Amino acid sequence: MKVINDPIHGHIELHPLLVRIIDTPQFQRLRYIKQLGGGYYVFPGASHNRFEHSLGVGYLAGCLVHALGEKQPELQISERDVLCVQIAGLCHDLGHGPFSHMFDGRFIPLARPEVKWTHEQGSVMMFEHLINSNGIKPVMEQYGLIPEEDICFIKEQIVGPLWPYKGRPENKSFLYEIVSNKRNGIDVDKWDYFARDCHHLGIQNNFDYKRFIKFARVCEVDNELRICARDKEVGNLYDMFHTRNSLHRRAYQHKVGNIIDTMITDAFLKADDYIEITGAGGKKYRISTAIDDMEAYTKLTDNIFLEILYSTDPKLKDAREILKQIEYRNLFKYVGETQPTGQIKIKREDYESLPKEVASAKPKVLLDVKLKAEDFIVDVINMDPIDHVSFYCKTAPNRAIEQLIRVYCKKVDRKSLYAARQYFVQWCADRNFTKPQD
Amino acid sequence: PMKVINDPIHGHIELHPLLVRIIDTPQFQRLRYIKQLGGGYYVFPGASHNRFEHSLGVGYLAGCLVHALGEKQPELQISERDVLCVQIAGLCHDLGHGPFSHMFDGRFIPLARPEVKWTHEQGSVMMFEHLINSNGIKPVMEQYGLIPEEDICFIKEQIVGPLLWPYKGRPENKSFLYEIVSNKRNGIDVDKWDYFARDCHHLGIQNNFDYKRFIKFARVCEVDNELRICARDKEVGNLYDMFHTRNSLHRRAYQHKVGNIIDTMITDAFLKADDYIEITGAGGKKYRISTAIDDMEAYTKLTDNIFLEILYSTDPKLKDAREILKQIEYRNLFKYVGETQPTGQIKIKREDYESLPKEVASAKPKVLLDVKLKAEDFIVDVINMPIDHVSFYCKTAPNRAIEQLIRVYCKKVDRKSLYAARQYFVQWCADRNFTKPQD
Amino acid sequence: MKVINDPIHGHIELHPLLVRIIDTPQFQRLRYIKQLGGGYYVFPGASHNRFEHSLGVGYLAGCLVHALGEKQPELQISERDVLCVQIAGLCHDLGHGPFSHMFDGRFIPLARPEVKWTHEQGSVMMFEHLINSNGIKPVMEQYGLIPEEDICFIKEQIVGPLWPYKGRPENKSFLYEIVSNKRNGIDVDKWDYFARDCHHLGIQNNFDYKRFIKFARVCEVDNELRICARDKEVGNLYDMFHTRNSLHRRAYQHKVGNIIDTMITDAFLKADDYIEITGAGGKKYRISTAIDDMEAYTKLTDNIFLEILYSTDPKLKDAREILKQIEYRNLFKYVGETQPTGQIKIKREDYESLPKEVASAKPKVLLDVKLKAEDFIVDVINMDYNPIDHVSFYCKTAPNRAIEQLIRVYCKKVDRKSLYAARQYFVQWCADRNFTKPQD
Amino acid sequence: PMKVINDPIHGHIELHPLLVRIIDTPQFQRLRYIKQLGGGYYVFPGASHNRFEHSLGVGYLAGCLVHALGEKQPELQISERDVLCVQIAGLCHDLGHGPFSHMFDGRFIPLARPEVKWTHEQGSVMMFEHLINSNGIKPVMEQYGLIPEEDICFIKEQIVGPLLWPYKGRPENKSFLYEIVSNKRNGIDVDKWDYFARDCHHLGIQNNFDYKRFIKFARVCEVDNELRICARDKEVGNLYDMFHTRNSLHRRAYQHKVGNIIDTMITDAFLKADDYIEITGAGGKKYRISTAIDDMEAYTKLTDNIFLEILYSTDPKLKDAREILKQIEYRNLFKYVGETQPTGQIKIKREDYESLPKEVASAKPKVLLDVKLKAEDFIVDVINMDIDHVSFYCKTAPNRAIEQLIRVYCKKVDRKSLYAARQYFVQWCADRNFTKPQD
Ligand SMILES: Nc1nc2c(ncn2[C@@H]2O[C@H](COP(=O)(O)OP(=O)(O)OP(=O)(O)O)[C@@H](O)[C@H]2O)c(=O)[nH]1
Ligand SMILES: Nc1nc2c(ncn2[C@@H]2O[C@H](COP(=O)(O)OP(=O)(O)OP(=O)(O)O)[C@@H](O)[C@H]2O)c(=O)[nH]1
Ligand SMILES: Nc1nc2c(ncn2[C@@H]2O[C@H](COP(=O)(O)OP(=O)(O)OP(=O)(O)O)[C@@H](O)[C@H]2O)c(=O)[nH]1
Ligand SMILES: Nc1nc2c(ncn2[C@@H]2O[C@H](COP(=O)(O)OP(=O)(O)OP(=O)(O)O)[C@@H](O)[C@H]2O)c(=O)[nH]1
Ligand SMILES: [Fe+3]
Ligand SMILES: [Fe+3]
Ligand SMILES: [Fe+3]
Ligand SMILES: [Fe+3]
């Protein structure tokens, strides 16, 4: 029964089971993986990692359940239910890779285009590895959990259904909207990293989750059980959503922030063949295939960045040279942005091909310089109002009331940069993407 | 052409292009990979911040203060040359920190090479000379009005002190400029300001000191015909809030019991790994962790990275060290035996840190005990550390002015062995004449 | 330089000029006038008076002005302007009478239908009395105020134009939206008693004025200069308006709260002839006429309730009997509520006549008992004002430019047959007055 | 039929109809016209609250606690009759307070009638009996199961104490019920809880004590085989913060310097007016302010109202008193001379308050001074203050348990007379052997 002090949430009381899950290598791994990935090289305050964030989500998961259980004893929320939601929140991010969203969103699609991989697949594999490597399942039983039944439940809360849910019956469906919510984008995962990311980026977060948790209730909608907010709390809700918008516009879509991310992945790609990560049975993996074995994956952290940078191996001199360019601030240069409006969206599978298409656009008038596909970086940003949440009133508590595409150039001179803007504008034309602004 | 960096504690920070030129180097970005609070992060989840953002802030506050004194008092003859120099000093005062900051020069080097006198402040000066040579900064200095010979002296001296008026970099009439970045006398400098605001911010402690206010009311005045930086009498209230902050950070965070236990565990791994880990320095030569300080090129490559190189290593030579770091991940820590302080004005010197376990373990405690422990089973932790010396002035007359702790840990966790450790220690305290350890 | 500790605003720093206005009898008057009138008899937490509310307004006025002056120097806002806005905030309630709104809203319309009286007229008369009785004008100039021009500005901030304004040029119009705002219902006066009234009533006030003040800016709107808010702060504004709505629904329109107000007024009416208030030149005034002399008005406070209650005077036995009714809790009984929807609103001038009308409605079928006009109390409750649309905004990208009546009737007769009789008359009176049909 | 009142501090308060019958009387509603902190309101604008809302809260808390003890411990034989009585007691414990609360019996009556022994708790008992007699409560008591003879005794005893086991109202096996409303020994009762919460709320002070929690873990247990109310050991953390609230209210509010000066000014006005004011009592007789305590019917009409009655007066017999209250409005207060304490454990008795200025004025203070002051120029303010003495229990074995300040003010405000006042006072402290005044 430890008490941890967190700068956003204050004191976080931790169930001994939770403590047993937290003091394992598969969880301490999150201490070495930046929350905002390449954010830190643009935002100096953003040194924070997945680890404390996982702590906060786990805490927020629990605050909400225990709250719903107290205001409404008829939901039959058990001490068993609160522990699983707490464990799920804690481990939803077990599967993040080097520099978080950079890894499953850009590196694996470029490194192994055929493979379908998400960090949510990654978390469940890592959670399974965690409870097996550390004999967690006996300790679950010691505190009243049913390992077969509850381990499924935690997994389904993280990666979704593997009525589709086997972990809990539908009269407890609302337990599935606590940690991550597909429908109205309101979950304790957002709350923590909304509060957390503003705190480190120097943005003001006026959203008050304690207030929202206090007035939160389960209510019936289309004969479905959902979590609802009372009508007074729409003012708080506009402040939640305005923060989500500021974080995206100001932080998550930052131009240099995202340019630098593609430089890092270009380094990991040129370095993928020459770095070995040690797995099970002593087998050796590459950076891109360590996702295939969880003990190697345990060992795949932000560390790999510095390992490349400090390397003396001549085989890694290319990968090294790109990371020296991040340190010297000689970055890739911005060419332009465009959108596939009205058009079919670019799929993760087709990322590898895009620079070849850009370099192949025929931009007549003819140009002084010619560029090959290796001089182009094509960066796909996927985006994934108030009205879509469901409310209630005190009188009737029973009843309910994109893709951006950016192109960077590795060549830094004005004559070549001009050329790049020309190819780029042509490629947009004959792909029927929107016309780039000047 | 100014770069503007957004910082959570100081906001928008405008950076002179010269400052930028210095920042975008490996000798500086190296600070992105060094925890401000070392092993603190393993006790306070918020303490993930590194020396890097802190170095930006000091550089900023330095400039803020100099520029402020210069505008209010033009007779001080503070130049753009002078301001730039003070700023670089803030920027580069932490260039020399080692893996996990103070754990490194404060415990590791004293335990690994007792013969050596090494400080991060010496290190900051070597790294700074190394920085400006490797990156052709001296032409860039000359371009913005710096005289490299004279001014490079000034920056080093603001960092490491005099290398009679001991300073060769600036005359005594500009003496006050040596009090901005690092103030030896009253411990009030813009560097403390940054890491008090910054360390409170990440730890969730309330900090009531308002430096913007303190800077706004700061003046140079004559005290014993020496020029010092002074505060208005009204602002003695703001000063007390700084010191209540210095005191709660020390009690609550930097002297935290598990925090300092974990430091020594980390340091025990670095010691047990020092011989089998190689860092490539200049001229291709190879250095060890403890001797990499002898070359700034190897030293550049020595960051928090080394904790994970040890943890992820498969080398069978490193298993002994690796196991201490795996202990930390599993949370089986060294055990607290007790705390004491050395009475009188005597303080244990850094050179004698290595001997301390030999002394504690050799103490003869009577009654004789069930177990006898070797010195290798003891960790001795030396933990080191108010208007007086501050100068004030009044609005009417602006020209003129008005510890060590020792904790001992046992590596053996068994109750019989733990009981033994407490006895040796209580004895050791006795005829070293340290104070009696309490229950 | 004084500092006052207040439970809603923390520390309130007061300019010595302000303290000089406060330490006078005309201002200390407000310590003895309940903010919520008959509220205290329904809400035990509601003991707060005009005195602390006025302080808060004065403080909040200054907070807003100083904010605008520091973020936007081109407005040319002086320390003189700040003092004037503060004094105006401070003295905007000098003219409230016994139990505040009961007095200018119901007693004077029943005691003297002929007269036009508002507490806003009252504030100016009393403010004029204050600065004259305490030799304030010499002290005003001591701190840089121009007595002639600035006393105008202050009166005008309270009671309106006496471009219509003589106190400040049109390039400083926005200074007229701080203390009281006719247009968008956003001012520092409502800000105070929204927080202050919730604090004492046990209601949650989520509105953060500090946050709103930090992002407030002056902008050009239709070639008009007004106070605007950043688009971000609509979330905060929604919570302000919800508070305004709860205070009105739950507190200011409380059914028993309003019954008790009409009783106190019934007692003041029956006592008006027999109570004498000493004015200037020693003349003696009545409750209804002390408003005609500001020296007598000063001594007219909530005190008068207890003077009636403690009386042994047989002339006041009638009044005394009603104040005994309130305390034994034998109150007037609720008969019903209705609205003048679609019809002309009942004017203050016509309040006196209404019970005669209600008692004259022919409620056929005939009833076992008959009621006289003296057995009816009709209470006209006015609440003059998406409201969120009438606010003006800006975004950081374009900082230069901008983006009812209730009628209740109570009966004094408390038996079931008479109450039933009463409902019939009331339901009829609504019928041939074309007011809404009363609900069950 | 249960009425429910919303309280800003305690939320919804459900009132037994019997309780409502008692509240809606003149003797009780009298408390709507008596400030809780009296003259405090003239120093703290938030402090406008009266005894009335406080009495409701005590009544609410009394029932809350009695009901909880009964639910966890059915063996205590706590009846619906017992609970009603404790509640009425909480409600009516403050029935006897006079104009401006503690100012009245603590200073006005001791100075106006030095011979008489009067406390408000005595007053509460008389007012309570007048209450049930004049308003026919005893038939209503019998209707809800109270036995008027036995229980009216019990209610009085909870208020003024015993009039060997001294209590006739309830047997010793129900002794603990006497510790709820007012607890003489360990200063922990629900009366204190209420005005600690309420006084914080209106003063803007932070109150960390959680009564709801403390109530949840309270139990009756045997202490020296005597029955006492106990707290669970784990929850002592809650107790320390109760006492910390008691400490801040006293340091920051109740012993406030100008607040207490003002109270003696009000008292000086009541004294200069005691003779010319008539309050009509029973049998038509006329009483003075100081003797209205002799008749409960007169006392009923004596509230804060007497203050404005004096101030608004045009009567010239009352012109002297009027001027002291006119001083208050213009803020020309009495001036502070100094503070002292009675060294030794001796306290100045209320009976001797009147003479205190006579002693001060006759002190021969050589050095001889330019001016001499008479006793009419001195105000002597006696300020009275009324953690381990609490009884605890453990979850495993629940059945069994584990000052005065004196201030002096001067009415003459000039520099020359004020200096004299300090000397007379310093001397008086000397030859009364009280401690040396500071500053
Ligand atoms: N267990 C654990 N605690 C952490 C961690 N990070 C921060 N903490 C906090 O740091 C403090 C020290 O951690 P512990 O290893 O549990 O030290 P301890 O509380 O003395 O543990 P015991 O040896 O069981 O007494 C705790 O109070 C936690 O609040 C972590 O990763 N694991
Ligand atoms: N130069 C530099 N900027 C940093 C660093 N860390 C954070 N930043 C911030 O991140 C922003 C990223 O911009 P830059 O890296 O300078 O790229 P840029 O804006 O194209 O710079 P220019 O090409 O000179 O215009 C900077 O303006 C800084 O505010 C750093 O280490 N070096
Ligand atoms: N002047 C004044 N102060 C008030 C009033 N209401 C509350 N206060 C506060 O209560 C205390 C009143 O004491 P003052 O006489 O005004 O100030 P003081 O320090 O006691 O006396 P001086 O400063 O010497 O005149 C102060 O702390 C004020 O903050 C008021 O109506 N007038
Ligand atoms: N009885 C009583 N209620 C009060 C008092 N102060 C506030 N209240 C609250 O104010 C409400 C209004 O008073 P009521 O007692 O209901 O008056 P009423 O409705 O005319 O009387 P009933 O119809 O018999 O209930 C009460 O229900 C209480 O919740 C008080 O002093 N006495
Ligand atoms: Fe997450
Ligand atoms: Fe530093
Ligand atoms: Fe107002
Ligand atoms: Fe009390």
Coordinates of N, CA, C and O in Angstrom, one line a residue, chain B residues 20-112:
Chain B
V20 N 22.8 30.1 -29.6 CA 22.3 29.0 -30.3 C 23.4 28.1 -31.0 O 23.3 26.9 -31.0
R21 N 24.4 28.8 -31.4 CA 25.5 28.2 -32.1 C 26.2 27.2 -31.2 O 26.6 26.1 -31.5
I22 N 26.3 27.6 -29.9 CA 26.9 26.8 -28.8 C 26.0 25.6 -28.4 O 26.5 24.6 -28.1
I23 N 24.7 25.8 -28.4 CA 23.7 24.9 -28.0 C 23.6 23.6 -28.9 O 23.4 22.5 -28.4
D24 N 23.7 23.9 -30.2 CA 23.6 22.9 -31.2 C 24.9 22.2 -31.4 O 25.4 22.2 -32.5
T25 N 25.5 21.7 -30.3 CA 26.8 21.0 -30.4 C 26.6 19.7 -29.6 O 25.6 19.6 -28.9
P26 N 27.4 18.7 -29.8 CA 27.3 17.5 -29.0 C 27.7 17.7 -27.5 O 27.1 17.2 -26.6
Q27 N 28.7 18.6 -27.2 CA 29.1 18.9 -25.9 C 28.0 19.5 -25.0 O 28.1 19.4 -23.8
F28 N 27.1 20.1 -25.7 CA 25.9 20.6 -25.0 C 24.7 19.7 -25.0 O 24.1 19.5 -23.9
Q29 N 24.3 19.2 -26.1 CA 23.1 18.4 -26.2 C 23.3 17.1 -25.4 O 22.3 16.4 -25.0
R30 N 24.6 16.8 -25.1 CA 24.9 15.8 -24.1 C 24.1 15.9 -22.8 O 23.9 14.9 -22.1
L31 N 23.8 17.1 -22.5 CA 23.0 17.4 -21.3 C 21.6 17.0 -21.4 O 20.9 17.0 -20.4
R32 N 21.1 16.6 -22.6 CA 19.8 16.0 -22.7 C 19.7 14.6 -22.2 O 18.6 14.0 -22.2
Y33 N 20.8 14.0 -21.8 CA 20.9 12.6 -21.5 C 21.5 12.4 -20.1 O 22.2 11.4 -19.8
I34 N 21.2 13.4 -19.2 CA 21.7 13.5 -17.8 C 20.6 14.0 -16.9 O 20.3 15.2 -17.0
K35 N 20.1 13.1 -16.1 CA 19.0 13.5 -15.2 C 19.5 14.6 -14.2 O 20.5 14.6 -13.6
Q36 N 18.6 15.6 -14.1 CA 18.9 16.7 -13.2 C 19.0 16.1 -11.8 O 20.0 16.3 -11.1
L37 N 18.1 15.2 -11.5 CA 18.0 14.7 -10.1 C 18.5 13.3 -9.9 O 18.3 12.7 -8.8
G38 N 19.3 12.7 -10.9 CA 19.9 11.4 -10.8 C 18.9 10.3 -10.5 O 18.0 10.0 -11.3
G39 N 19.2 9.6 -9.4 CA 18.3 8.5 -9.0 C 17.0 9.0 -8.4 O 16.1 8.2 -8.0
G40 N 16.8 10.3 -8.3 CA 15.6 10.9 -7.8 C 14.4 10.4 -8.6 O 13.3 10.2 -7.9
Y41 N 14.5 10.3 -9.9 CA 13.4 9.8 -10.8 C 12.9 8.4 -10.3 O 11.7 8.1 -10.7
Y42 N 13.6 7.6 -9.6 CA 13.2 6.3 -9.2 C 12.3 6.3 -8.0 O 11.8 5.3 -7.5
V43 N 12.2 7.5 -7.4 CA 11.4 7.8 -6.2 C 10.3 8.8 -6.5 O 9.2 8.7 -6.1
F44 N 10.6 9.8 -7.3 CA 9.6 10.8 -7.7 C 9.3 10.7 -9.2 O 10.2 11.2 -10.0
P45 N 8.2 10.2 -9.6 CA 7.9 10.0 -11.0 C 8.0 11.2 -11.9 O 8.2 11.1 -13.1
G46 N 7.8 12.4 -11.3 CA 7.8 13.6 -12.0 C 9.2 14.1 -12.3 O 9.4 15.0 -13.2
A47 N 10.2 13.6 -11.7 CA 11.6 14.1 -11.8 C 12.4 13.5 -13.0 O 13.5 13.0 -12.8
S48 N 11.8 13.6 -14.1 CA 12.4 13.1 -15.4 C 13.2 14.2 -16.1 O 13.8 13.9 -17.1
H49 N 13.2 15.4 -15.6 CA 13.8 16.5 -16.3 C 15.3 16.4 -16.3 O 15.9 15.8 -15.4
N50 N 15.9 16.9 -17.3 CA 17.4 16.8 -17.4 C 18.1 18.1 -17.2 O 17.5 19.1 -17.1
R51 N 19.5 18.0 -17.2 CA 20.3 19.2 -17.0 C 20.1 20.1 -18.2 O 20.4 21.3 -18.0
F52 N 19.7 19.6 -19.3 CA 19.6 20.4 -20.5 C 18.6 21.6 -20.4 O 19.0 22.7 -20.6
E53 N 17.4 21.3 -20.1 CA 16.4 22.3 -20.0 C 16.8 23.3 -18.9 O 16.7 24.5 -19.0
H54 N 17.3 22.7 -17.8 CA 17.8 23.6 -16.7 C 18.9 24.5 -17.2 O 19.0 25.6 -16.8
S55 N 19.9 24.0 -18.0 CA 21.0 24.9 -18.5 C 20.4 26.1 -19.3 O 21.0 27.2 -19.3
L56 N 19.4 25.8 -20.1 CA 18.7 26.9 -20.9 C 18.2 28.0 -20.0 O 18.3 29.2 -20.3
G57 N 17.5 27.5 -18.9 CA 16.9 28.4 -18.0 C 17.9 29.4 -17.2 O 17.6 30.5 -17.0
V58 N 19.0 28.8 -16.8 CA 20.0 29.6 -16.1 C 20.6 30.6 -17.1 O 20.8 31.8 -16.7
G59 N 20.8 30.2 -18.3 CA 21.3 31.1 -19.3 C 20.4 32.3 -19.5 O 20.8 33.5 -19.6
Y60 N 19.1 32.0 -19.5 CA 18.0 32.9 -19.6 C 18.0 33.8 -18.4 O 18.0 35.1 -18.6
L61 N 18.0 33.3 -17.2 CA 17.9 34.1 -16.0 C 19.1 35.0 -15.9 O 19.0 36.1 -15.4
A62 N 20.3 34.5 -16.2 CA 21.5 35.2 -16.1 C 21.3 36.5 -17.0 O 21.5 37.6 -16.5
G63 N 21.0 36.3 -18.2 CA 20.8 37.4 -19.1 C 19.7 38.4 -18.6 O 19.9 39.6 -18.6
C64 N 18.6 37.8 -18.1 CA 17.6 38.7 -17.6 C 18.0 39.6 -16.5 O 17.7 40.8 -16.5
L65 N 18.9 39.1 -15.6 CA 19.3 39.9 -14.4 C 20.4 40.9 -14.9 O 20.3 42.1 -14.4
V66 N 21.4 40.6 -15.7 CA 22.4 41.5 -16.1 C 21.8 42.7 -16.9 O 22.1 43.8 -16.6
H67 N 20.9 42.3 -17.8 CA 20.2 43.3 -18.7 C 19.4 44.2 -17.9 O 19.3 45.4 -18.2
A68 N 18.8 43.7 -16.8 CA 18.0 44.5 -15.9 C 18.9 45.5 -15.1 O 18.5 46.7 -15.0
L69 N 20.0 45.1 -14.5 CA 20.9 46.0 -13.8 C 21.5 47.1 -14.7 O 21.5 48.2 -14.3
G70 N 21.8 46.7 -15.9 CA 22.3 47.6 -16.9 C 21.4 48.7 -17.3 O 21.8 49.8 -17.5
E71 N 20.1 48.4 -17.4 CA 19.1 49.4 -17.8 C 18.8 50.4 -16.7 O 18.7 51.6 -16.9
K72 N 18.7 49.9 -15.4 CA 18.4 50.8 -14.3 C 19.7 51.6 -13.9 O 19.5 52.7 -13.4
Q73 N 20.9 51.1 -14.1 CA 22.1 51.7 -13.7 C 23.1 51.8 -14.8 O 24.1 51.0 -14.8
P74 N 23.0 52.7 -15.8 CA 23.9 52.8 -16.9 C 25.3 53.2 -16.5 O 26.2 53.0 -17.3
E75 N 25.5 53.7 -15.3 CA 26.9 54.1 -14.9 C 27.7 52.8 -14.6 O 29.0 53.0 -14.4
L76 N 27.1 51.7 -14.5 CA 27.8 50.4 -14.3 C 28.6 50.0 -15.5 O 29.4 49.1 -15.5
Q77 N 28.3 50.6 -16.7 CA 29.0 50.4 -17.9 C 28.9 48.9 -18.4 O 29.9 48.4 -18.9
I78 N 27.7 48.3 -18.2 CA 27.5 47.0 -18.7 C 27.2 46.9 -20.2 O 26.3 47.5 -20.7
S79 N 28.1 46.2 -20.9 CA 28.0 46.2 -22.4 C 27.3 45.0 -22.9 O 27.0 44.0 -22.1
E80 N 26.9 45.0 -24.2 CA 26.4 43.8 -24.8 C 27.5 42.7 -24.8 O 27.2 41.5 -24.9
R81 N 28.7 43.1 -24.8 CA 29.8 42.1 -24.7 C 29.7 41.4 -23.4 O 29.8 40.1 -23.4
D82 N 29.5 42.1 -22.4 CA 29.5 41.6 -21.0 C 28.2 40.7 -20.8 O 28.3 39.6 -20.2
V83 N 27.1 41.1 -21.3 CA 25.9 40.4 -21.1 C 25.9 39.0 -21.8 O 25.6 38.0 -21.2
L84 N 26.5 39.0 -23.0 CA 26.6 37.7 -23.8 C 27.5 36.8 -23.0 O 27.2 35.6 -23.1
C85 N 28.5 37.3 -22.3 CA 29.4 36.5 -21.6 C 28.8 35.8 -20.4 O 29.1 34.7 -20.1
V86 N 28.0 36.6 -19.7 CA 27.3 36.1 -18.5 C 26.3 35.0 -18.9 O 26.2 34.0 -18.2
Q87 N 25.6 35.2 -20.0 CA 24.7 34.3 -20.5 C 25.3 32.9 -20.9 O 24.7 31.8 -20.5
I88 N 26.4 32.9 -21.6 CA 27.1 31.7 -21.9 C 27.5 31.0 -20.6 O 27.4 29.7 -20.6
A89 N 27.8 31.7 -19.6 CA 28.2 31.1 -18.3 C 27.1 30.3 -17.7 O 27.3 29.2 -17.3
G90 N 25.9 30.9 -17.7 CA 24.7 30.1 -17.3 C 24.5 28.9 -18.1 O 24.3 27.8 -17.6
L91 N 24.6 29.1 -19.4 CA 24.4 28.1 -20.4 C 25.3 26.9 -20.2 O 24.9 25.7 -20.4
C92 N 26.5 27.2 -19.8 CA 27.6 26.2 -19.8 C 28.1 25.8 -18.4 O 29.1 25.1 -18.3
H93 N 27.4 26.3 -17.4 CA 27.8 26.0 -16.1 C 27.6 24.5 -15.8 O 28.2 24.0 -14.9
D94 N 26.7 23.9 -16.5 CA 26.5 22.4 -16.3 C 27.0 21.4 -17.4 O 26.7 20.2 -17.3
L95 N 27.9 21.9 -18.2 CA 28.5 21.1 -19.3 C 29.2 19.9 -18.8 O 29.3 18.9 -19.5
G96 N 29.7 20.0 -17.5 CA 30.5 19.0 -17.0 C 29.9 17.9 -16.1 O 30.6 17.1 -15.5
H97 N 28.6 18.0 -16.0 CA 27.9 17.0 -15.1 C 28.1 15.6 -15.7 O 28.2 15.5 -16.9
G98 N 28.1 14.6 -14.9 CA 28.3 13.3 -15.3 C 27.1 12.5 -15.2 O 26.1 13.1 -14.8
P99 N 27.2 11.2 -15.5 CA 26.0 10.3 -15.4 C 25.3 10.5 -14.0 O 25.8 10.3 -13.0
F100 N 24.0 10.9 -14.1 CA 23.2 11.1 -13.0 C 23.6 12.3 -12.1 O 23.3 12.4 -10.9
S101 N 24.2 13.3 -12.7 CA 24.6 14.6 -12.1 C 25.5 14.4 -10.9 O 26.6 13.9 -10.9
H102 N 25.0 14.8 -9.7 CA 25.8 14.9 -8.5 C 26.3 13.6 -8.0 O 27.3 13.5 -7.2
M103 N 25.6 12.5 -8.4 CA 26.0 11.2 -7.9 C 27.4 10.9 -8.4 O 28.2 10.2 -7.7
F104 N 27.8 11.4 -9.5 CA 29.0 11.1 -10.2 C 30.3 11.7 -9.6 O 31.3 11.0 -9.6
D105 N 30.3 13.0 -9.3 CA 31.5 13.6 -8.8 C 31.5 13.6 -7.3 O 32.6 13.7 -6.7
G106 N 30.3 13.4 -6.8 CA 30.1 13.4 -5.3 C 30.3 12.1 -4.6 O 30.5 12.0 -3.4
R107 N 30.2 11.0 -5.4 CA 30.3 9.6 -4.8 C 31.1 8.7 -5.7 O 32.0 7.9 -5.2
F108 N 30.8 8.7 -6.9 CA 31.5 7.7 -7.8 C 33.0 7.9 -8.0 O 33.8 7.0 -7.7
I109 N 33.4 9.1 -8.4 CA 34.8 9.4 -8.6 C 35.5 9.4 -7.2 O 36.6 8.9 -7.1
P110 N 34.9 9.9 -6.2 CA 35.6 9.7 -4.9 C 35.7 8.2 -4.5 O 36.7 7.9 -3.8
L111 N 34.8 7.3 -4.9 CA 35.0 5.9 -4.5 C 35.8 5.1 -5.5 O 36.3 4.1 -5.1
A112 N 35.9 5.5 -6.7 CA 36.6 4.9 -7.8 C 38.1 5.3 -8.0 O 39.0 4.5 -8.3

